[PDB]
Design an enzyme around this catalytic site. Structure first.
Site, PDB file in Angstrom:
ATOM      1  N   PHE A 177      19.720   2.873  25.908  1.00 18.97           N
ATOM      2  CA  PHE A 177      20.557   3.468  26.943  1.00 18.97           C
ATOM      3  C   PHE A 177      22.031   3.382  26.570  1.00 18.97           C
ATOM      4  O   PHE A 177      22.490   2.361  26.036  1.00 18.97           O
ATOM      5  CB  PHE A 177      20.474   2.812  28.328  1.00 18.97           C
ATOM      6  CG  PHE A 177      19.131   2.974  28.991  1.00 18.97           C
ATOM      7  CD1 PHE A 177      18.116   2.055  28.751  1.00 18.97           C
ATOM      8  CD2 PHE A 177      18.882   4.042  29.850  1.00 18.97           C
ATOM      9  CE1 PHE A 177      16.891   2.178  29.379  1.00 18.97           C
ATOM     10  CE2 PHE A 177      17.675   4.138  30.480  1.00 18.97           C
ATOM     11  CZ  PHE A 177      16.683   3.232  30.253  1.00 18.97           C
ATOM     12  N   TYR A 212       8.829  -1.396  30.208  1.00 20.02           N
ATOM     13  CA  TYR A 212       7.578  -0.978  30.825  1.00 20.02           C
ATOM     14  C   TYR A 212       6.343  -1.643  30.243  1.00 20.02           C
ATOM     15  O   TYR A 212       5.236  -1.324  30.677  1.00 20.02           O
ATOM     16  CB  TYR A 212       7.482   0.543  30.755  1.00 20.02           C
ATOM     17  CG  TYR A 212       8.556   1.203  31.611  1.00 20.02           C
ATOM     18  CD1 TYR A 212       8.466   1.277  32.977  1.00 20.02           C
ATOM     19  CD2 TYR A 212       9.744   1.618  31.040  1.00 20.02           C
ATOM     20  CE1 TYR A 212       9.451   1.876  33.751  1.00 20.02           C
ATOM     21  CE2 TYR A 212      10.744   2.204  31.786  1.00 20.02           C
ATOM     22  CZ  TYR A 212      10.591   2.369  33.146  1.00 20.02           C
ATOM     23  OH  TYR A 212      11.612   2.915  33.853  1.00 20.02           O
ATOM     24  N   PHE A 221      14.239  12.134  26.294  1.00 18.98           N
ATOM     25  CA  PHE A 221      15.622  11.859  26.666  1.00 18.98           C
ATOM     26  C   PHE A 221      15.807  12.142  28.152  1.00 18.98           C
ATOM     27  O   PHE A 221      15.231  13.088  28.690  1.00 18.98           O
ATOM     28  CB  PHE A 221      16.616  12.766  25.935  1.00 18.98           C
ATOM     29  CG  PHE A 221      16.316  12.788  24.451  1.00 18.98           C
ATOM     30  CD1 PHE A 221      15.267  13.559  23.943  1.00 18.98           C
ATOM     31  CD2 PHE A 221      17.044  11.987  23.573  1.00 18.98           C
ATOM     32  CE1 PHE A 221      14.991  13.576  22.574  1.00 18.98           C
ATOM     33  CE2 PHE A 221      16.764  12.003  22.206  1.00 18.98           C
ATOM     34  CZ  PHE A 221      15.737  12.788  21.706  1.00 18.98           C
ATOM     35  N   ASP A 222      16.735  11.432  28.764  1.00 13.74           N
ATOM     36  CA  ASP A 222      16.936  11.561  30.192  1.00 13.74           C
ATOM     37  C   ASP A 222      18.370  11.153  30.463  1.00 13.74           C
ATOM     38  O   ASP A 222      18.826  10.154  29.926  1.00 13.74           O
ATOM     39  CB  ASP A 222      15.987  10.632  30.952  1.00 13.74           C
ATOM     40  CG  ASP A 222      16.307  10.428  32.425  1.00 13.74           C
ATOM     41  OD1 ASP A 222      16.474  11.432  33.132  1.00 13.74           O
ATOM     42  OD2 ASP A 222      16.435   9.266  32.836  1.00 13.74           O
ATOM     43  N   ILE A 241      14.250  -1.380  35.699  1.00 16.11           N
ATOM     44  CA  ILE A 241      13.684  -2.317  34.729  1.00 16.11           C
ATOM     45  C   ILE A 241      14.545  -3.563  34.600  1.00 16.11           C
ATOM     46  O   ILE A 241      15.743  -3.528  34.881  1.00 16.11           O
ATOM     47  CB  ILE A 241      13.396  -1.640  33.408  1.00 16.11           C
ATOM     48  CG1 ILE A 241      14.677  -0.988  32.831  1.00 16.11           C
ATOM     49  CG2 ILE A 241      12.243  -0.659  33.535  1.00 16.11           C
ATOM     50  CD1 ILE A 241      14.520  -0.521  31.408  1.00 16.11           C
ATOM     51  N   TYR A 291      24.262   7.433  32.935  1.00 14.82           N
ATOM     52  CA  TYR A 291      23.505   6.915  31.803  1.00 14.82           C
ATOM     53  C   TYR A 291      22.913   8.062  31.011  1.00 14.82           C
ATOM     54  O   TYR A 291      22.702   9.148  31.543  1.00 14.82           O
ATOM     55  CB  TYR A 291      22.383   5.936  32.178  1.00 14.82           C
ATOM     56  CG  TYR A 291      21.156   6.560  32.834  1.00 14.82           C
ATOM     57  CD1 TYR A 291      21.129   6.821  34.210  1.00 14.82           C
ATOM     58  CD2 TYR A 291      20.052   6.933  32.087  1.00 14.82           C
ATOM     59  CE1 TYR A 291      20.037   7.411  34.816  1.00 14.82           C
ATOM     60  CE2 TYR A 291      18.982   7.592  32.674  1.00 14.82           C
ATOM     61  CZ  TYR A 291      18.950   7.785  34.046  1.00 14.82           C
ATOM     62  OH  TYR A 291      17.879   8.399  34.624  1.00 14.82           O
TER      63      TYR A 291
HETATM   64  C1  LIG Z   1      14.792   9.903  36.441  1.00 15.00           C
HETATM   65  O1  LIG Z   1      13.368   9.534  36.404  1.00 15.00           O
HETATM   66  C2  LIG Z   1      13.020   8.505  35.605  1.00 15.00           C
HETATM   67  C3  LIG Z   1      13.792   8.060  34.507  1.00 15.00           C
HETATM   68  C4  LIG Z   1      13.316   6.999  33.677  1.00 15.00           C
HETATM   69  C5  LIG Z   1      12.005   6.508  33.975  1.00 15.00           C
HETATM   70  C6  LIG Z   1      11.224   6.999  35.033  1.00 15.00           C
HETATM   71  O2  LIG Z   1       9.965   6.626  35.362  1.00 15.00           O
HETATM   72  C7  LIG Z   1       9.336   5.845  34.360  1.00 15.00           C
HETATM   73  C8  LIG Z   1      11.732   8.031  35.821  1.00 15.00           C
HETATM   74  O3  LIG Z   1      10.987   8.441  36.882  1.00 15.00           O
HETATM   75  C9  LIG Z   1      11.026   7.401  37.997  1.00 15.00           C
HETATM   76  C10 LIG Z   1      12.438   6.982  38.500  1.00 15.00           C
HETATM   77  C11 LIG Z   1      13.136   5.829  37.659  1.00 15.00           C
HETATM   78  C12 LIG Z   1      12.264   4.640  37.561  1.00 15.00           C
HETATM   79  C13 LIG Z   1      12.938   3.468  36.996  1.00 15.00           C
HETATM   80  O4  LIG Z   1      13.815   3.747  35.796  1.00 15.00           O
HETATM   81  C14 LIG Z   1      14.450   2.700  35.237  1.00 15.00           C
HETATM   82  O5  LIG Z   1      14.343   1.558  35.648  1.00 15.00           O
HETATM   83  C15 LIG Z   1      15.210   3.005  34.032  1.00 15.00           C
HETATM   84  C16 LIG Z   1      16.735   2.542  34.259  1.00 15.00           C
HETATM   85  C17 LIG Z   1      17.351   3.477  35.309  1.00 15.00           C
HETATM   86  C18 LIG Z   1      17.387   4.836  34.723  1.00 15.00           C
HETATM   87  C19 LIG Z   1      16.021   5.342  34.439  1.00 15.00           C
HETATM   88  N1  LIG Z   1      15.137   4.467  33.649  1.00 15.00           N
HETATM   89  C20 LIG Z   1      14.198   4.981  32.801  1.00 15.00           C
HETATM   90  O6  LIG Z   1      13.436   4.122  32.263  1.00 15.00           O
HETATM   91  C21 LIG Z   1      14.099   6.405  32.559  1.00 15.00           C
HETATM   92  C22 LIG Z   1      13.579   6.731  31.167  1.00 15.00           C
HETATM   93  C23 LIG Z   1      13.195   8.172  31.102  1.00 15.00           C
HETATM   94  C24 LIG Z   1      12.544   8.505  29.832  1.00 15.00           C
HETATM   95  C25 LIG Z   1      13.571   8.220  28.667  1.00 15.00           C
HETATM   96  C26 LIG Z   1      14.034   6.771  28.698  1.00 15.00           C
HETATM   97  C27 LIG Z   1      14.577   6.308  30.091  1.00 15.00           C
END
Ligand SMILES: COc1cc2cc(OC)c1OCCCCCOC(=O)[C@@H]1CCCCN1C(=O)[C@H]2C1CCCCC1
Length: 128
Positions: free
Chosen positions: A118, A101, A55-56, A75, A45
């Site tokens: 995404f 969130y 960005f990630d 999420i 992703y």
């Molecule tokens: C890789 O680290 C991330 C990445 C996202 C969010 C995170 O915490 C809020 C984060 O730290 C905690 C681990 C992931 C927590 C849950 O993340 C998620 O549910 C979604 C979908 C799976 C990929 C990650 N993700 C995120 O919301 C990223 C987010 C990171 C900032 C830019 C927009 C995406």
């Protein structure tokens, strides 16, 4: 660019039809099978905030992102969106805060009331 095209052309895949999760398939997968709740799912992703400030990417970690669908690890929008995907599909998802969130956000990384975008590649999914 890609987010606005999803606003414009995206399919609303919410049950409530509230445009909370919009999708475009960008590269089509194969197989009739989509992940069922419980499955181990493997993706790549790229994600960002609508505010342009974060960005990630799974690629940053040089490894797939793995999670169990519907098992509370991601999420809501991901549980909803990835259930629609086929093996090898690339999709674009635009996500309102209610399916990400929320009002609280996830500070400091995600602000309150954040819309997220995404690109997701579904690599594989295996049964519990
Ligand atoms: C890789 O680290 C991330 C990445 C996202 C969010 C995170 O915490 C809020 C984060 O730290 C905690 C681990 C992931 C927590 C849950 O993340 C998620 O549910 C979604 C979908 C799976 C990929 C990650 N993700 C995120 O919301 C990223 C987010 C990171 C900032 C830019 C927009 C995406």
């Amino acid at each position: 660019g890609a987010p606005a095209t999803v606003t414009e052309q995206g399919e609303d895949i919410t049950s409530k039809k509230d445009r909370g999760v919009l999708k475009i398939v960008k590269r089509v997968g194969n197989g009739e099978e989509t992940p069922m709740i419980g499955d181990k799912v493997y993706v790549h992703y790229k994600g960002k905030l609508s505010n342009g400030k974060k960005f990630d990417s799974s690629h940053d970690r040089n490894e797939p992102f793995v999670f169990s669908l519907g098992k509370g690890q991601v999420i809501k929008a991901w549980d909803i969106g990835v259930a629609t995907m086929k093996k090898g599909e690339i999709a674009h998802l635009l996500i309102k805060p209610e399916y990400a969130y929320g009002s609280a956000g996830s500070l400091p990384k995600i602000p309150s009331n954040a819309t997220l975008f995404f690109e997701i590649e579904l690599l594989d999914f295996k049964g519990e």
